[PDB]
Amino acid sequence: KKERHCRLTSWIVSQIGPEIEEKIRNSSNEIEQIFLYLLLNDVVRASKLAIESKNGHLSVLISYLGSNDPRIRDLAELQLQKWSTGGCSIDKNISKIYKLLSGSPFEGLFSLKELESEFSWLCLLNLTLCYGQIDEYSLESLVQSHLDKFSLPYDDPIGVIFQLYAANE
């Protein structure tokens, strides 16, 4: 399961690669770049840029992405509720990153679903597959979880294959 997961996610990163690299080319904000590096499933360069842009704590936090530590998951979500109940202002991309640490980035109450309009469906699916709750789910039911949140274009065949894969039963 781990092997298969790693190959799938390396491949998705192969596909979304240029899209995101373009987006990083045009960003004017460092924390957003850090997020985009997480979009390429590159935890280390996110951590590094964080470090460099003087965002050190975040940097540490980032290092958890891809270990599925449920403690960190519920803590990140907690921080998010506390902000989303008062929290006079939190940077738009730090909240996104915390939402990634929450393990349920659309499935949620600070939801990245609106990124539906800014990214390839495959890009977001990468987010579910990499963070998302890897251990608790089978590859199939995980992918299915994601698909349940987003309609794919009828005509797109790589979409179709994911649907047939997730459809299992």
Binding site: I51, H57, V60, Q79, D91
Partner: protein, 418 residues
């Protein structure tokens, strides 16, 4: 009454020679000294606070002795661990600590060091929530890294003052081994992100893959890209505009040596602890590199690769704390740590031929020598036992406790002459 003391120690020896395992002797010696440490400490002349600390020290010595000799001597050799390359770093760390006794000893010693570390009382009136700067307006982001992204002028003074209280408390807890309490404090004091940082301490294990620990664990845990984590933390530790205790924490976690502002207040024990931690960290990461269980991507930054020897750490920490270093039971502490112990026995023996000036010493060395030859027959030279007991006995006489001299006699035919 307190001029009972010798009885207690003598008493323990009685019980041992009479139920005809010897590690209990020392355990009792420890408790005995500790009990006495309490007596002189409670209500006392301020001439007693000194000899009270010399008893607490006494006690710690017996403890250290127990721990190390138990591990070294109760060594009955178990089964070797057979890893594969597919195995997690967690297992390799474990293997390292199993196979390398020299290094596990360092662990034992650090454990002892932590055991005896002071921690402040839990801060009272802690606030409802973090950086509550928010109220002044001006936190555009509520994340720890915001005032790092742009001038620290963002954070209110009182907030910094509280962050100071927190990070200092967490630091003391970390040096004491209280990692669970540190995580509890982080959680409960609305420092979730710092908590999360403290979670990176564990190497990765997966009970499913790393079969040989499918007992201790039911769920994967720990973090796979640890060499990264470690550079990430260390770099964070070097970034200024953080509270000195926070930086201190990250230093300790990265296997590094905390900043001057914090380190200046560390004593022999604290400092020694810091540097053994460094030895240890470095040695593990090297063990992992020699087995290709580190991935090149993670070598973000240079950390030092050359581990000190316990010998050298001791020498340096010594020269950094000469007064403390030279204290006669702490010399024994080091002597035990390096195993050069009969070495020092025979030594302080020849110092009877400014050891007579301090009272605990002549006693301690004698009872230690006794314990040693009990646990390891042959340990201390026959002569040295003779000389030591001879002199201590003559003090049992000077104290007028002839009553309990036969017990000490049970180690020579020289006893004939009493």
């Amino acid at each position: 009454y307190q001029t009972e003391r010798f009885t207690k120690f003598s008493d323990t020896l009685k019980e041992f020679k009479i139920e005809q395992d010897p590690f209990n002797i020392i355990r009792e010696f420890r408790s005995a000294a500790g009990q006495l440490a309490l007596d002189l400490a409670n209500s006392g002349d301020e001439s007693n606070v000194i000899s009270s600390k010399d008893w607490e020290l006494e006690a710690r010595f017996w403890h250290l002795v127990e721990l190390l000799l138990v591990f070294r001597n109760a060594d009955l050799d178990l089964d070797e661990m057979e890893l594969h390359p597919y195995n997690s770093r967690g297992l390799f760390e474990k293997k390292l600590m199993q196979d390398n006794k020299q290094l596990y000893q360092i662990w034992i010693v650090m454990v002892w060091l932590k055991e005896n570390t002071y921690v402040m009382e839990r801060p009272k009136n802690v606030p409802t929530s973090k950086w509550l700067s928010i109220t002044s307006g001006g936190l555009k982001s509520c994340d720890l890294d915001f005032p790092l992204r742009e001038n620290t002028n963002v954070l209110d003074v009182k907030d910094k003052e509280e962050d100071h209280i927190f990070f200092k408390y967490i630091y003391e807890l970390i040096l004491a081994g209280a990692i669970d309490e540190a995580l509890e404090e982080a959680k409960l004091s609305d420092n979730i992100s710092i908590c999360m940082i403290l979670c990176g301490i564990q190497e990765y294990l997966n009970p499913v893959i790393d079969t040989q620990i499918a007992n201790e664990f039911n769920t994967q845990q720990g973090i796979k890209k640890h060499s990264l984590w470690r550079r990430t933390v260390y770099s964070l530790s070097q970034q200024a505009g953080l509270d000195p205790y926070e930086r201190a924490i990250y230093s300790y976690l990265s296997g590094a040596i905390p900043n001057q502002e914090v380190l200046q207040y560390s004593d022999w024990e604290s400092d020694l602890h810091i540097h053994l931690n460094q030895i240890l960290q470095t040695e593990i990461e090297n063990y992992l590199l020699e087995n290709n269980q580190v991935g090149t991507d993670e070598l973000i930054l240079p950390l030092p690769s050359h581990a000190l020897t316990v010998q050298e750490v001791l020498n340096r920490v010594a020269s950094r704390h000469p007064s403390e270093s030279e204290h006669p039971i702490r010399v024994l502490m080091a002597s035990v740590i390096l195993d050069s112990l009969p070495s020092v026995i025979h030594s302080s023996v020849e110092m009877l031929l400014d050891i007579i000036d301090k009272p605990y010493l002549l006693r301690i060395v004698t009872h230690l020598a006794i314990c040693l030859d009990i646990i390891n027959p042959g340990s201390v030279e026959e002569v040295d036992k003779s000389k030591l007991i001879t002199t201590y006995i003559s003090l049992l006489k000077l104290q007028g406790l002839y009553e309990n001299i036969p017990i000490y006699a049970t180690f020579l035919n020289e006893s004939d002459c009493l």
